Amino acid sequence: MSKISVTVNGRRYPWPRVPAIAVCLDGCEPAYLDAAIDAGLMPALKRIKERGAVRLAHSVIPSFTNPNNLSIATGSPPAVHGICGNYLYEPSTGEEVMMNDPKFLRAPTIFQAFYDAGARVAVVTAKDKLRALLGKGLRFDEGRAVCFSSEKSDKATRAEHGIDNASAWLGRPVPEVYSAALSEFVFAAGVKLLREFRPDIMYLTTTDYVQHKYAPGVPEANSFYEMFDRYLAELDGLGAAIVVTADHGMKPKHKADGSPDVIYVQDLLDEWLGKDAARVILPITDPYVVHHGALGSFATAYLPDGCDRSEIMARLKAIQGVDVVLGREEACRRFELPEDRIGDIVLVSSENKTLGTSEHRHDLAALDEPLRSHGGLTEQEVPFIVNRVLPELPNAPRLRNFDAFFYAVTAAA
Numbered sequence: 248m249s250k251i252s253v254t255v256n257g258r259r260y261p262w263p264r265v266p267a268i269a270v271c272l273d274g275c276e277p278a279y280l281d282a283a284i285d286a287g288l289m290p291a292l293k294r295i296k297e298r299g300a301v302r303l304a305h306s307v308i309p310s311f312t313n314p315n316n317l318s319i320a321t322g323s324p325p326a327v328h329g330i331c332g333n334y335l336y337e338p339s340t341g342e343e344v345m346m347n348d349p350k351f352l353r354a355p356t357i358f359q360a361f362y363d364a365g366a367r368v369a370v371v372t373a374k375d376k377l378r379a380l381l382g383k384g385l386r387f388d389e390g391r392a393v394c395f396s397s398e399k400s401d402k403a404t405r406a407e408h409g410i411d412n413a414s415a416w417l418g419r420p421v422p423e424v425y426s427a428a429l430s431e432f433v434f435a436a437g438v439k440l441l442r443e444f445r446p447d448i449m450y451l452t453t454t455d456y457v458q459h460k461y462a463p464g465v466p467e468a469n470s471f472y473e474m475f476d477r478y479l480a481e482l483d484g485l486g487a488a489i490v491v492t493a494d495h496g497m498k499p500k501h502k503a504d505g506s507p508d509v510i511y512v513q514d515l516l517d518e519w520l521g522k523d524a525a526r527v528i529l530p531i532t533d534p535y536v537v538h539h540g541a542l543g544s545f546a547t548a549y550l551p552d553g554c555d556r557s558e559i560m561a562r563l564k565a566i567q568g569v570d571v572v573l574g575r576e577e578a579c580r581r582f583e584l585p586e587d588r589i590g591d592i593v594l595v596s597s598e599n600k601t602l603g604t605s606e607h608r609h610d611l612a613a614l615d616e617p618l619r620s621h622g623g624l625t626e627q628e629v630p631f632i633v634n635r636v637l638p639e640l641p642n643a644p645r646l647r648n649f650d651a652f653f654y655a656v657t658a659a660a
């Protein structure tokens with residue numbers, strides 16, 4: 248007898264005999280789990296690690312939320328699926344255009360491919376914009392798909408989400424967007440879906456709210472992972488094959504005095520090339536954001552026609568804190584990104600620095616606590632833990648976070 252599989256974006260996924268789950272722990276620097284385990288707070292993950300397969304994996308660069316979630320969802324890098332930031336800039340038009348709409352997704356998700364093959368599929372996110380992206384191609388007329396966010400759980404309908412009011416269904420209020428509870432809702436929905444819906448494929452993804460605010464091992468960080476472990480214990484107890492991974496890690500990005508440590512790329516380019524001759528883009532978040540949530544460790548820049556790219560790159564790389572500077576072609580090959588949605592040059596900052604645009608009218612910082620962020624090579628390493636014996640499972644740099652569903656269904660088969 249031939250084995251059953253689903254082929255998606257050039258990869259063959261065996262059909263899962265038991266439910267196959269990937270959990271994306273947003274911003275989960277491996278140190279978070281080590282600290283919580285060491286404090287005795289994750290007895291289930293501790294045991295799961297001992298008896299399963301424990302690895303580190305590499306995220307996509309940029310180590311941002313959307314590109315990495317979409318990579319996990321499609322099993323492919325952004326060169327394939329097209330989502331490589333929150334927005335891009337169009338030199339013609341002079342327009343900044345949001346890349347977080349499903350129309351910009353260029354490759355099918357694993358979720359749609361399994362759904363189209365007759366599977367039961369469930370996707371739960373914390374934020375609703377990612378929900379719409381992740382849910383592209385799912386259908387809700389056969390009772391075989393569920394897709395909603397904690398954020399808009401009370402707005403779910405049968406026809407568009409596969410469930411009527413997921414808040415009422417789960418029996419928990421809609422959580423505050425800026426809370427651990429937004430992510431707890433996802434875990435809780437996941438458990439209830441596993442019991443009652445019995446998906447063949449399920450993705451659970453959260454937000455990095457806690458991780459931007461709190462370093463590994465501090466009480467609030469430990470409490471979050473203590474909470475996760477309870478849901479993990481339950482998913483594991485119900486017999487699912489589970490991969491726990493992350494979209495990206497998290498590192499402190501502040502000076503000794505606790506203030507943000509930023510390299511203002513637009514200021515530098517204005518000086519060398521003329522004011523606004525170039526455009527620096529900060530794709531970590533939406534373009535309107537100026538409140539320190541716009542500070543990450545990866546940036547891209549669009550340069551005036553004719554200028555000396557090679558020269559400009561050398562000038563940027565000479566700056567302390569700027570670790571990597573690549574032209575479009577090279578950055579796209581190295582990081583597996585789409586040339587048509589990346590700037591002329593790509594910049595990656597050092598471990599404890601971020602990249603900003605300018606101090607002209609500035610980038611007024613919001614929250615109090617010392618800056619923590621992601622986007623660079625120093626937030627690329629993430630946990631990758633499976634609750635099954637898989638001695639052949641590769642390790643980083645070969646293992647990618649977007650191998651999560653490949654190995655989950657393999658373990659489930």
Ligand SMILES: [Zn+2]
Binds near residue numbers: 311454494
């Ligand atoms: Zn994230």
Ligand SMILES: [Zn+2]
Binds near residue numbers: 312
């Ligand atoms: Zn973040």
